[PDB]
RNA sequence: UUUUGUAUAAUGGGUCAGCGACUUAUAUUCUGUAGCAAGGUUAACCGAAUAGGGGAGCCGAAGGGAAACCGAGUCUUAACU
RNA sequence: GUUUAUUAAAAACACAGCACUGUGCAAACACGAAAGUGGACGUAUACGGUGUGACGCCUGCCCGGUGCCGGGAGGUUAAU
RNA sequence: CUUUAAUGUUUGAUGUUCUAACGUUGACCCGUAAUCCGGGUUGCGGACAGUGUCUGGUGGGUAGUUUGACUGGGGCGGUCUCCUCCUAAAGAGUAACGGAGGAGCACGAAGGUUGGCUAAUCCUGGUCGGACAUCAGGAGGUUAGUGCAAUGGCAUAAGCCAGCUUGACUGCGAGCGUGACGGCGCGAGCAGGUGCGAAAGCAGGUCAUAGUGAUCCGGUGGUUCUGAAUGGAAGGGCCAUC
């Protein structure tokens, strides 16, 4: 399991975030299966979270940026 | 356990108790002898020895006497 | 050293017990007290066990 | 070569956020009928390693 | 010359650890609630206003303020109170 | 030199010349200094081979809890003033 | 007679003699992973080990302890 | 079904006989001009002996080691952990093979409360009955008592008696004291439930200070916290305890 800061969502790709998509940007280890997005940094862009385990703080701070969280 | 009748079992029981009494008497003898040894001095700068002390300490043990009633039933004279 | 160790087992049905000592010679009758049971959060009867 | 961490120490201390080490209070393993519940309750939480013993711990745990 | 040396033995020689009794916060000292004032064995000092007594007869502050010592009472006993100062 | 303490009648050295004892791998923490900086840095390796590639990884920006898990909170607890 | 070459030559060791004990021969025993050797090209009047130590007069009592020998009934008891 | 008895059937034990494995350091023959070795006849033993694996016993024959410290030198004697007093110099602490004693528990009441009560000792009168038993009133005033050493304390009793009881609660805990740490101790108050009291209130063991043993390893109960592909489980962890 791994942690994802809100500052890494702008560092990944065009805007879709998933386990496979996070590894290709070298944010989590290639043998990581579960990731959680925490409220650590600040997200400015409309990022969509494909399948992950965002916290309530991270979730609100993503919708404020215009993002979307799904499974 | 025992295979036999009451009288044969009784005989076996007396033999068992006699052997136990003899072994207890031998234990008393050996304990007295080793106590006599313990109560001596070192005689020089030589051993005395802790192995024999340990043997005597473990030899000082407890045995269960038979709680046999036998002839004490006291009927007071009226 | 004649006070052996006993545990009072809750009668609430949960596995919970206080533990204490008891003179097994002078008090052969099993102990029985109404103590608190944090599992159910109610004062219930505890009975002596091994 | 790499320093071998004392493995027995790594089973009893965990590093905290600021660098201190947390451990589990002794005297809570057995012989618990004697001890009052007040004493046993206070020994249940984990404690922080003392200032004097921090040096001994850090040497035994150079990698964590 | 098997006479020069001599020896003996002793039957006492054991004591107990010291318990660090005595007054901890003296008169006029300002304390917080719960601070131990005197660690006694009996009741050399008795609990006064705003101070309490433990099972060891330890006198502790029940409020925060200055320690005071008094000899009030019909038996001329020393009492420790606390003034909320 | 060793000692509480040595002119010590305590140790060592006849004297000269030459040699003779805190080093070197790695790993880790701290200090100084230098570069970059929420980033820093590559290893093996490839290489017209002190360059340039190579970011596998490592450390860091998040912690709490034995853990699941939660997450600027978390654990304890039925709940915490 | 022997002995501590190099501070001890002796009352020490050995000794003939004595006793106990083991050993039936592919002997006991010893050396040797073993093969095999010695014992012994011997055979209980023989060989081994132990103690004592010419010779003379003798070698008293104790089998409880430790050991050894015999016994097999019963008890405890391994791997399976 | 119940007992029983018979021929069968399997199996197990013990025993006797046999030969064919195996042994032969018996004889003869051949390799071979060789008392080695091998092969062949034969005799004798014979599923014994012997060897391999496993196993019980014995095993200073051999091997590796252990065999504490303090100490008015070492050995010998004594001691080694805890509590009380003195040494200890009116805060704490403070050594000696200094001076004295104790502990390794007890108690479901000897704990909690609510009521009530107050001793030792002596004097006087009183049936056996006195030096001292129980009774009555007088002095006395805690010289008594405290589950057990000593010290401190205790009349509002902490001492003695009775009714009801289980707070000898569970989670915590401001703040302290004491330790080099491990640790140890005191604690108001908060939440949940409880006992006693009409209530105010008190109760998280006992008048206090001794009554003890880290960790590892393992045992028992509970808890799906974990569960090496997955669902379980085993094993772990957590809680309580041995
Ligand atoms: Mg039990
Ligand atoms: Mg001179
Ligand atoms: Mg000199
Ligand atoms: Mg640097
Ligand atoms: Mg005999
Ligand atoms: Mg025999
Ligand atoms: Mg040896
Ligand atoms: Mg009262
Ligand atoms: Mg309450
Ligand atoms: Mg009521
Ligand atoms: Mg499990």
Curated annotation (Swiss-Prot), chain C:
Give the lineage.
Bacteria, Pseudomonadati, Pseudomonadota, Gammaproteobacteria, Enterobacterales
Q: Which organism is it from?
A: Escherichia coli (strain K12)
One GO cellular component term of this record is: cytosolic large ribosomal subunit
Superkingdom of this protein's organism: Bacteria
Query: Which BP terms does GO give this entry?
Result: cytoplasmic translation; response to antibiotic; ribosomal large subunit assembly
Task: List the InterPro entries hit by this protein, alphabetically.
Answer: Ribosomal_bL33, Ribosomal_bL33_CS, Ribosomal_bL33_sf, Ribosomal_zn-bd
* Family matches, as PANTHER family: 54S RIBOSOMAL PROTEIN L39, MITOCHONDRIAL (PTHR15238), LARGE RIBOSOMAL SUBUNIT PROTEIN BL33M (PTHR15238:SF1)
UniProt-listed Pfam families: Ribosomal_L33 (PF00471)
Write down the HAMAP family for this protein, in alphabetical order: Ribosomal_bL33 (MF_00294)
User: What's the family?
Assistant: Belongs to the bacterial ribosomal protein bL33 family.
Q: What else is known?
A: Surface exposed on the 50S subunit.
Under Gene Ontology molecular function, one entry of this record is: structural constituent of ribosome
Gene name, Swiss-Prot/TrEMBL: rpmG
The protein depicted here goes by the name: Large ribosomal subunit protein bL33
Question: Subunit notes for this chain?
Answer: Part of the 50S ribosomal subunit. Cross-links to the P and E site tRNAs.
List keywords of the entry alphabetically: Methylation, Ribonucleoprotein, Ribosomal protein, RNA-binding, tRNA-binding
Curated annotation (Swiss-Prot), chain D:
Could you state one GO cellular component term attached to this entry? cytosolic large ribosomal subunit
Q: Name one GO molecular function term.
A: structural constituent of ribosome
What processes in GO biological process is this protein linked to?
translation
Q: Which domain of life is it from?
A: Bacteria
Q: State if Ribonucleoprotein is listed as a keyword.
A: yes
Question: Which of UniProt's keywords are assigned here?
Answer: Ribonucleoprotein, Ribosomal protein
The UniProt family comment states: Belongs to the bacterial ribosomal protein bL35 family.
What's the name of the protein?
Large ribosomal subunit protein bL35
Which gene codes for it?
rpmI
UniProtKB/Swiss-Prot annotation, chain E:
Pfam family, any one? Ribosomal_L27
GO MF annotations, alphabetized: structural constituent of ribosome
Q: Which residues form the signal peptide?
A: none
- Tell me the superkingdom of the source: Bacteria
Indicate whether Ribonucleoprotein appears among the record's keywords: yes
Question: Has UniProt tagged this entry with the keyword Glycoprotein?
Answer: no
Q: Which UniProt keywords apply?
A: Ribonucleoprotein, Ribosomal protein
Region Disordered: what ranges? 1-20
Q: Name one GO cellular component term.
A: cytosolic large ribosomal subunit
Report the record's Gene Ontology biological process terms.
Answer: translation
Q: Which InterPro entries match?
A: Ribosomal_bL27, Ribosomal_bL27_CS
What family does this chain come from, according to its entry? Belongs to the bacterial ribosomal protein bL27 family.
The UniProt entry, under HAMAP family, shows: Ribosomal_bL27
What name is this protein filed under? Large ribosomal subunit protein bL27
The gene it comes from is: rpmA
